[model samples]
Target: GAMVDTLDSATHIKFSKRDIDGKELAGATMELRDSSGKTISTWISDGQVKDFYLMPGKYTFVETAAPDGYEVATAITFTVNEQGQVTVNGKATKGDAHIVMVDA
Candidate 1:
């Protein structure tokens, strides 16, 4: 006899940043939001790479903010099916800015 079990429900979102020359950007801020456009979590990474784990469902991932010397903000809407994973990549100019998601 064999037994099967369902996997844990969670959504993973990963992102990375790079300069115009393709150099990794460090100390960039990353943010997460829900479908209703509500802020859920925020984190700053040493490298351009970052990841977030959330409950499986729909979510609006955005680079709510960026570090100094970085300009421009970016945002994207994505859905996370049950036990699904989503990945996002973003680029920023030179200055302090962030991206946010609002209810439509």
Candidate 2:
């Protein structure tokens, strides 16, 4: 006897902003890149959440910018499975989100 399994092709990738304490933080950004180190999609956290479509493959999520008064521990690295599971390894922390001006 042979067995078959249901396979989902479409995968919904959601990237959001969360503070060090795991609180919702807005105004963050993440660049989606493929195996060739090329950017595919640009995602920005609005504290409202957004979803992007992607196929099962290898990818890297680079943290371009952090939310106001927040910092990141490191870049998030993961992949998309055949089951199309949602990965939420993205993280950050509260830090200096200020701009200091210097006179020349």
Candidate 3:
């Protein structure tokens, strides 16, 4: 017989940047909010975000603004599992695809 053991209650959320050909992508602003659409936290995806241990609850994430060329991505919603593992999905903020990136 086997038994399940408890692990550290730490969840590390990460972001990946890529394109249709799965090339490189970067420079983005993101928003972390509650279920009601109220902004709970905000971060820039130039690097890893503050994946601080969140209590067992539901949360939402949206790309408020994309980089110079990327599109505002669809929001993301996630929750922590009983196994103390955090689950999240990877999505590109597809504001526009063919739109040429313009300078500010």
- lDDT against the true structure, each candidate: 0.49, 0.51, 0.47
Which candidate should be chosen as best, given TM-score against the real structure? 2
Candidate 1, clashing residue pairs? 64-99, 65-98, 69-95, 70-95, 71-93, 71-95
Q: List the residue pairs that clash in candidate 3.
A: 71-95, 73-93
Q: Write candidate 1's Cα lDDT for 12-46 as tens digits.
A: 44544555554556666656678777888777656
Q: Residue-wise lDDT of candidate 3 within 20-50, one digit each (tens)?
A: 5533345766676766778877766543323
RMSD of each: 12.8, 13.3, 11.6
TM-score on alpha carbons, each prediction: 0.56, 0.62, 0.56
Clashes of 1: 6
How does residue 3 of candidate 1 score in lDDT?
12
